[PDB]
Each structure stands twice: as structure tokens, then as C-alpha cells.
């Protein structure tokens, strides 16, 4: 059994949906947001919310699960594609990068929602060529739909990425799901062995170095003491096996797996100062800067629409009860 009501979200329209175990709220106005996910059996909130609509306004990529299209830093917001050269606005002044894309605090429609015995369905899309300063800035008619479901214990969501343009263009998405995360109580986990080296503005050098304490990060470890703001590569590509960050919860018991699919080849896991209360393990298709690196797109993730066609990236959060 599952449901989807239309609700007011800090006075912004917003569509709850979901079924037994789980329950979402979306919020096409803020960047297709999805600013609350909570585990019905257990009624524990696993995202952190904005206290106000202004306080979201102020950080949009801190709560809730912000959209990054693309994800993290261009320096100097300048890179070329195929001879031609591109400049994106600087909005990271102090370490003078663009940052984190173009579509998390923009408006996005419901293209559809959809309900059977498979679970429920919402779906959100935003056409680039209808933004007109984006187009100053990324003059391509991309298109990026959202598809949702909660089937089971399962969030699934899935970006389909769409050239409808004349021109080939690069791309990438990455999320910057901020779940609460308890510094005395909780735990996590990521499959990755190896992170890229960053520069003082956060931008990749091109070098990859060992994680040291990898095995405390496979199996679990706390992070108290420990500010992250790092740039992890996934294991997956080079050992295969999982693609994911788990957070346990000590004391309700649950464990949160956010699984996301073969392109999905770098995870950022950021903390702030790690007295916040929160942590964002953010799956990306391409690490911070690719468009500006060359090394091949087996590692850096870098993928390339042709007028006409379309890609879908997949990723999943299930709450585990044990």
C-alpha cells in the first residue's frame, strides 16, 4: 500500500509519497530537493531539515538531498570541450571556482507520479534551455529528469540525463544528501581504498593516494575527532564488489545503504568542522574538476551526450531495520 499527498513545506508546496516502511518529501521549487526521508516502523527522520525556508535559502546544498548538475569545483569556472571554451559563474569567491551546478535552487516540475503494487513513483524534470542565465553560461539543451520510487525499504532515484540539442556536451550529477549523523552514536562505512590529492582551492592535483586507515572505512568507524571534506575514489571500478556509504545508527539500530551504480565513480564525504550533527556521503558521476583533467574517462568519470541521446544514472538509499 503506498500514497502521495500534495502538503506545504515551510510555505512551499511539496508532494509527501510512500508506502509502509518509508516515507519521502520532495520539493520541485528547491531544486527538486528531497528535504525529509523517514523510516515509518522505527519514525526516525534520517535527513537533515531546515529549521526556516530562509535558512535553506541560505545553505540549499546542506539539507535534504540537493541536486549537484555539476558536482563540486571548476576552477576559474573555465574549461574547453571539444576546442570550445566554456565559463561558468564564480560563486566559491575565495577559492575562485564555480561550485556545485545549476539546478539546486531552481524551479523543477512533476512531470508524473505513479502508484501500483511496484511502489510509488514521482518524477521531476527541468529543461536547462528554458533558464535563460544558464544558457549564458552552458548553452546546451540538456534536460534532467528525476525519477523517485519507494518500493519496499527502498528510495531509488534515478537521474536521466537528455541532449535535445544541436551539440555534443559534457556531464556529470552528484548529490549532496546530508543525513543526520549522531558523532557520538554513529557509524560509517564507504567502499573506497584510494582519494585524490586536492590543492588548497579543493582541486584535484591528478594524483590518487592510499587511504590509511581503509580498513576501519570498509568495516565502520566513527568519526569523531576526524573533518572530512574529501574526495574518494570508488573501489568498485578497480576490485569490483559494492559501490556504497553505509551510516549505522547505534541506538534505533538501523543502517542506511546508499548504493549508486558503475558511474557513479567518486564519493565527497563532508562533515563541516564534525560538531554539526550531520555528514553527506555525495556519490558522484565524475570527480571534482574533470572537465579540466586529462586522464581518461574510466577514472575520471567524464561522460559526453550526443544530440538525441539520453543517459540514466542510478543510486538507492535502503533502511535496513537490525
Given at each position: ?14 508532494i ?5 516502511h ?15 526521508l ?7 527522520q ?13 545553505t ?20 574547453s ?42 518524477e ?19 534536460v ?9 525499504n ?8 537528455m ?12 548529490y549532496?544528501?546530508?543525513?543526520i549523523?549522531?558523532?557520538?552514536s ?26 590509511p ?51 557513479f ?18 556519490p ?5 574538476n574533470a ?9 575520471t568519470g567524464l561522460?559526453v ?18
Amino acid at each position: 500500500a503506498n500514497f502521495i499527498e500534495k502538503i506545504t513545506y515551510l510555505g512551499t508546496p511539496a508532494i509527501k509519497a510512500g508506502n509502509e516502511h518509508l516515507e519521502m518529501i520532495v520539493v520541485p521549487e528547491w531544486g527538486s530537493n528531497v528535504i525529509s526521508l523517514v523510516d515509518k516502523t522505527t519514525n526516525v527522520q534520517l535527513l537533515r531539515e531546515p529549521e526556516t525556508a530562509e535558512s535553506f535559502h541560505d545553505t540549499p546544498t546542506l539539507y535534504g538531498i540537493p541536486i549537484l548538475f555539476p558536482p563540486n569545483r571548476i576552477s576559474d569556472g573555465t574549461f574547453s570541450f571539444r576546442g570550445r571554451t566554456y565559463h561558468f559563474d564564480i560563486n566559491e569567491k575565495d577559492k575562485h571556482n564555480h561550485l556545485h551546478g545549476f539546478l539546486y535552487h531552481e524551479k523543477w516540475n512533476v512531470v508524473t507520479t505513479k502508484q501500483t503494487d511496484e511502489g510509488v513513483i514521482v518524477e521531476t524534470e527541468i529543461d536547462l534551455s528554458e533558464l535563460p542565465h544558464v544558457q549564458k553560461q552552458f548553452p546546451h539543451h540538456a534536460v534532467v529528469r528525476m525519477t523517485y520510487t519507494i518500493k519496499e525499504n527502498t528510495l531509488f532515484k534515478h537521474a536521466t540525463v537528455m541532449n535535445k540539442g544541436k551539440e555534443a556536451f559534457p556531464w556529470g550529477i552528484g548529490y549532496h544528501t546530508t543525513f543526520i549523523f549522531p558523532a557520538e552514536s554513529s557509524l560509517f562505512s564507504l567502499t573506497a581504498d584510494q582519494q585524490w590529492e586536492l590543492d588548497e582551492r579543493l582541486l584535484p592535483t591528478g594524483k590518487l593516494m592510499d587511504v590509511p586507515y581503509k580498513e576501519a572505512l570498509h568495516e565502520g568507524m566513527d568519526l569523531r575527532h576526524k573533518q572530512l571534506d574529501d574526495v574518494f575514489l570508488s573501489s568498485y571500478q578497480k576490485r569490483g564488489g559494492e559501490n556504497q556509504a553505509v551510516i549505522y545508527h547505534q541506538h534505533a539500530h538501523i543502517s542506511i545503504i546508499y548504493k549508486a551504480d558503475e558511474q557513479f565513480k567518486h564519493w565527497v564525504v563532508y562533515n563541516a568542522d564534525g560538531k554539526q550533527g550531520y555528514l553527506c556521503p555525495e556519490p558522484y558521476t565524475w570527480v571534482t574538476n574533470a572537465v579540466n583533467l586529462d586522464l581518461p574517462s574510466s577514472l575520471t568519470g567524464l561522460q559526453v551526450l550526443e544530440p538525441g541521446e539520453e543517459t540514466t544514472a542510478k543510486s538507492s538509499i535502503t533502511i535496513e531495520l537490525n
